[PDB]
């Protein structure tokens, strides 16, 4: 297929202002009637080009006159000789049961539901499928009453009828103009959890949460989380819901996580259903994060939408930012920041070095569903967070207000948003805008000098962005670079220049610059890039002692964690080198002492201690190398864990027992203690083998909740403990009837350190709880194997690569979106050694030759092979 370019955006030749949809629903054959009110803005000789994919066109009318001046082309219906204003009427057929891709109107179990973002509405009827076309929708739905007792669409339900032959109908009307991507429709049978929420200004909102029959007992957390989201948006952003009714439907077959369709969010049931015996703390916090995210989209995405898809980050970065602020307000800000920074450096940096690298605002897109990315979302959010960092909360809030005042009811661009922040705040963001147009990870180098004569500290900070596959020309960014200076007793030294205060966020705007601070009364240990103030790799020659100093004294929790990460990074590299030469782990005692100090600091938040005692993941430490040796990294993570487990066995078991809790609560203090406790258990599982088998076996049989059961089952697999197969068998036997719970188990299989893991994963393709048609099962088994087991995926014999090729050969035909998610590990080939490159390259070449190669794979495969 063929690329679209951001610089080619033009306002459309036509607008639609109102559309009236009728659906005569049936899974085999749905008939859609679509009456649209349209207007020509372009030249009269310019036809109306309607997108449509896999539609059967039954008829076309223009002001009620059967139209003869039209034709069908590659994925469009083109209509000529139109007046300036007219009513378009289209009747077409689609087939939901055939729709395995889950784009458009498909079937999720017995239910019918939709997914329209980015360009799925065109799989439902011929339309102007692009988000700068906003219209008022009215949606009539007709269906078999026994099979589809609930019939849902956006807005308010405004009519209702029965018919002969056991069929009934409902009609919905949504007063707010929207682009078609936000359209949704659900038909099916559900248990419904109903509650209400009263807004800050008194508006009462009905809340309805639709789940499969039987699951009303895993719903209340999601409902609570929705309410918390609604309250928080009021408190922090001053934003209230704008309709009478908030529906959420939880379906099992879903490609995204969840989707912000106006007043009728549709969710992967993974990000709704929770019970203490089925869901972990991390699940609960995820459901919270995702429910909030779709809710915050009501303003940042719906009330103001995107002019074109290249502007995706206008809504995703800002809505991710909003979900992060919500989680951090209600829980631990530091733990939140830490985890978000682990994601940026672990996963996102890799993408920004890959064939798939793009700016948060892409300039070129072949298939748009390939741009729902770590970059657009997470880096997007970091870019928003830099704006916040430059402006401060009061000014950032004024920008939000101006953004809405200007663009409420319309579609906007990244630049529009950046301008609202500029105009409202008076901070100049012209240079800052470069963050939107430039790909890749900047590298910020820092050199320092202390001068005891003058009591001056000098930072020489310089920056470069290396070239990326997608751009050859790079330039300096506007980098907000936050610092704190610590004196010898751990107290902050004030930042001054010429005896006037100086702001602790430094504007690093040039390729190289020098900052000088006065009255530095003692040689400082610096905290640099404080709270990851910009998404950059930092290069500074730390001594280990500076790093341990920060772990004990730094005032910002995040810096303590981050210093520990920098400390470990040196020894991860050292030990990967040692591994390559057949040597055992080397690890100085002072390093171990530093981590002992954290464990027995009784004034440190247990959640912080827990993150500090969580080792970088294999992906996070792969970022430290040019060539990745994934076997070495895995083997090194294992060894480093054993070593600490031996070195700190007594403290670890003490803290493990100290944070035992008889009550289970989903409350931030309790989650912290359970997180620390289970981090301690993870180490002990890599220690004395009998004690391990006992603790891990006992915890598994004696929880209480899924957080503690999985933490133990998971150590049993990681450390290959004697009790493992039995625990894995209990779990299967209990939980097999339940996919969302089985997903955890598949992930564990797929990420097993054991020897024949691939052979196992293959066989699990036949497991009772696995199915190739459910994106969740695919992501847990196959996706976890390829993405999170790089020691087995990258076996020297190329067997992991061919396994993926098999799976992709299937999924390219079945579900291109899921397939594109799965291919990502294979297009990282240039970070591996030559032998691995050749084989990976070979596998991409095999997939490049598939009949009916999907656009989604195509785009990634050609970039990887270029
Ligand atoms: Na319009
Ligand atoms: Na907080
Ligand atoms: Zn979003």
Curated annotation (Swiss-Prot):
Alphabetized GO MF terms: alanyl aminopeptidase activity; aminopeptidase activity; identical protein binding; metallopeptidase activity; zinc ion binding
Free-text disruption phenotype from the record: A quadruple peptidase disruption (pepA, pepB, pepD and pepN) does not grow in M9 minimal medium, does grow better when supplemented with casamino acids.
Record's bilayer topology term: Peripheral membrane protein
Compartmental location: Cell inner membrane
GO CC, alphabetical: plasma membrane
Site (Transition state stabilizer): 377
EC numbers, comma separated: 3.4.11.2
Cofactor(s) annotated in UniProt: Zn(2+)
Family affiliation: Belongs to the peptidase M1 family.
Identification of the protein by name: Aminopeptidase N
Gene: pepN
């Amino acid at each position: 297929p063929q690329a679209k370019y951001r610089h080619d955006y033009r306002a459309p030749d036509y607008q639609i202002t109102d559309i009236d949809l009728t659906f005569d629903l049936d899974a085999q054959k749905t008939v859609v009637t679509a009456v649209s009110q349209a207007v020509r803005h372009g030249a009269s000789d310019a036809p109306l080009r309607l997108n449509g994919e896999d539609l059967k066109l039954v008829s076309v009318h223009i002001n009620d006159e059967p139209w003869t001046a039209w034709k069908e082309e590659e994925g469009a219906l083109v209509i000529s000789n139109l007046p300036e204003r007219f009513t378009l009427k289209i009747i077409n057929e689609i087939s939901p049961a055939a729709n395995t891709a889950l784009e458009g109107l498909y079937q999720s179990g017995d239910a019918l539901c939709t997914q329209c973002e980015a360009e799925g509405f065109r799989h439902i009827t011929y339309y102007l499928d692009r988000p700068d076309v906003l219209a008022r929708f009215t949606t009539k739905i007709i269906a078999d009453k026994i099979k589809y007792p609930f019939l849902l669409s956006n807005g308010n339900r405004v009519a209702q009828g029965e018919l002969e032959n056991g069929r009934h109908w409902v009609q919905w009307q949504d007063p707010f103009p929207k682009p078609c991507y936000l359209f949704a429709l659900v038909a099916g049978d559900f248990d419904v959890l109903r509650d209400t929420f009263t807004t800050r200004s008194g508006r009462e909102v009905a809340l309805e949460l639709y789940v499969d029959r039987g699951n009303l007992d895993r719903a209340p957390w999601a409902m609570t989380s929705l309410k918390n989201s609604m309250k928080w948006d009021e408190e922090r952003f001053g934003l209230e819901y704008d309709l009478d009714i908030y529906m959420i439907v939880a379906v099992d077959f879903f490609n995204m996580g969840a989707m912000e369709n106006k007043g009728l969010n549709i969710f992967n049931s993974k990000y709704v259903l929770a019970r203490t015996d089925t869901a972990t703390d991390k699940d609960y916090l995820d459901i919270e994060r995702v429910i909030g995210h779709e809710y915050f989209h009501n303003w940042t995405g719906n009330r103001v939408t995107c002019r074109d898809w290249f502007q995706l980050s206008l809504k995703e970065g800002l809505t991710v930012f909003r979900d992060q602020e919500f989680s951090s307000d209600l829980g631990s800000r530091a733990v939140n920041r830490i985890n978000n920074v682990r994601t940026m450096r672990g996963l996102q940096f890799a993408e920004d070095a890959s064939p798939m690298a793009h700016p948060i605002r892409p300039d070129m897109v072949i298939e748009m569903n390939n741009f729902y990315t770590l970059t657009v979302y997470e880096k997007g959010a970091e870019v928003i967070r830099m704006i916040h960092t430059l402006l401060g909360e009061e000014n950032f809030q004024k920008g939000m207000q101006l953004y809405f005042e200007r663009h409420d009811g319309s579609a906007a661009t990244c630049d529009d948003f950046v301008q609202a922040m500029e105009d409202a705040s008076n901070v100049d963001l012209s240079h800052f805008r470069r963050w939107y147009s430039q790909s890749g990870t900047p590298i910020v180098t820092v050199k320092d000098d202390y001068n005891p004569e003058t009591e001056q500290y000098t930072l020489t900070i310089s920056q470069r962005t290396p070239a990326t596959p997608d751009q050859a020309e790079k330039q300096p960014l506007h980098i907000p670079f936050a610092i704190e200076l610590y004196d010898n007793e751990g107290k902050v030294i004030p930042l001054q220049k010429g005896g006037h205060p100086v702001n602790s966020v430094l504007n690093v705007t040039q390729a190289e610059q020098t900052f000088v601070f006065d009255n530095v009364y003692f040689q400082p240990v610096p905290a640099l890039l404080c709270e990851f103030s910009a998404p950059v790799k930092l290069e500074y020659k730390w001594s280990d002692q500076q790093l341990t100093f920060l772990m004990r004294h730094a005032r910002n929790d995040f810096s303590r964690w981050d210093a520990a990460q920098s400390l470990l990074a040196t020894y991860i590299k050292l030990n990967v080198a040692r591994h390559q030469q057949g040597q055992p782990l080397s690890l100085p005692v002072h390093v171990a002492d530093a981590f002992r100090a954290v464990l027995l600091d009784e004034k440190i938040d247990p959640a912080l201690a827990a993150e500090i005692l969580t080792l970088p993941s294999v992906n996070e430490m792969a970022e430290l190398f040019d060539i990745i040796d994934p076997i070495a990294i895995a083997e090194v993570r294992e060894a480093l864990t054993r070593t600490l487990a031996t070195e700190l066995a007594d403290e670890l078991l003490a803290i493990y027992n100290a944070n035992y809790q008889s009550e289970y609560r989903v409350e931030h203090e309790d989650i912290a203690k359970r997180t620390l406790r289970n981090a301690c258990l993870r180490f002990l599982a890599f220690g004395e083998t009998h004690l391990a088998d006992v603790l891990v076996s006992k915890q598994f049989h004696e929880a209480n909740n899924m957080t503690d059961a999985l933490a133990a089952l998971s150590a049993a697999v990681a450390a290959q403990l004697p009790c493992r197969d039995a625990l894995m068998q209990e779990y299967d036997d209990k939980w097999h009837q339940n996919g969302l719970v089985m997903d955890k188990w598949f992930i564990l299989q797929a990420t097993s350190p054991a020897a024949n893991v691939l052979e196992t994963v293959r066989g699990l393709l036949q497991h009772r709880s696995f199915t190739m048609s459910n994106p969740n099962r695919i992501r847990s088994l196959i996706g976890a194997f390829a993405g999170s087991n790089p020691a087995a995926f990258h076996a020297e014999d190329g067997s992991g690569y061919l396994f993926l090729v098999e799976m992709l050969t299937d999924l390219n035909s079945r579900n291109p979106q899921v397939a594109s998610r799965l291919i990502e590990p294979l297009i990282r080939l240039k970070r591996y050694d030559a032998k691995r490159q050749e084989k990976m390259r070979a596998a991409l070449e095999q997939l490049k030759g598939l009949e009916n190669l999907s656009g989604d794979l195509y785009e990634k495969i050609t970039k990887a092979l270029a």
